[PDB]
Ligand binder design. Structure first.
Ligand SMILES: O=C(O)c1ccnn1C1CCOCC1
Length: 182
């Protein structure tokens, strides 16, 4: 509907797939080559469904910071016959706060969904479902089941993936450029 939505749509139309694990259907962001991300609570195994196609998982790594604290991001390399557009140059280098973000979701339950969430706080520590978690972004929107994996963008930056909420606030795990050096 405006320039934030333009950037979000451009990411959704080329850099997402629908991922299915035994724990549900998730928006999945493809970052480059056959490398994507998903919330760690998706519990990715040796096989995952990608747009309802049985796909071998070549590697899955549940990220933790150097204090050995959960970051809630799992990086997955997919045995897929097609590469993603490389969007690593849209990833922030540092932890930050943002204005005027959009949360975008694409699943069977919520197709073509876009939410203007407003201001994004560098929240930091969150007890996420009992699990101490770091590098959390917060926005004051009442997010719901079905939005985990959703992509958080500003104009020109892909800043996080949605991982939870408390009924009044939503929480995303940061994406940083340093996660996807090769
Ligand atoms: O997919 C894209 O490149 C796209 C769509 C809208 N804006 N962008 C980019 C253009 C260069 O600055 C960063 C954002």
């Amino acid at each position: 509907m405006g320039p934030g939505f333009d950037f979000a749509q451009a990411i959704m139309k080329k850099n997402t797939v629908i991922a299915r694990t035994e724990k549900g259907e998730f928006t999945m962001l493809g970052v480059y080559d056959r490398v994507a991300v998903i919330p760690t609570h998706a519990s990715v195994g040796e096989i995952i469904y990608i747009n309802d196609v049985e796909t071998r998982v070549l590697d899955a790594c549940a990220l933790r910071d150097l204090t050995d604290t959960n970051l809630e991001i799992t990086i997955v390399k997919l045995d897929r016959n097609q590469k993603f557009r490389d969007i690593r140059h849209f990833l922030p280098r540092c932890e930050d706060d943002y204005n005027d973000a959009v949360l975008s979701v694409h699943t069977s339950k919520f197709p073509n969904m876009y939410i203007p969430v407003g201001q994004v706080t560098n929240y930091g520590f969150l007890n996420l479902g009992g699990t101490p978690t770091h590098r959390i972004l917060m926005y004051n929107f009442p997010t719901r089941a079905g939005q985990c994996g959703g992509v958080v963008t500003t104009t020109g930056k892909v800043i996080g993936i949605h991982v939870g909420g408390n009924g009044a606030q939503g929480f995303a795990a940061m994406l940083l450029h340093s996660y996807f050096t090769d």
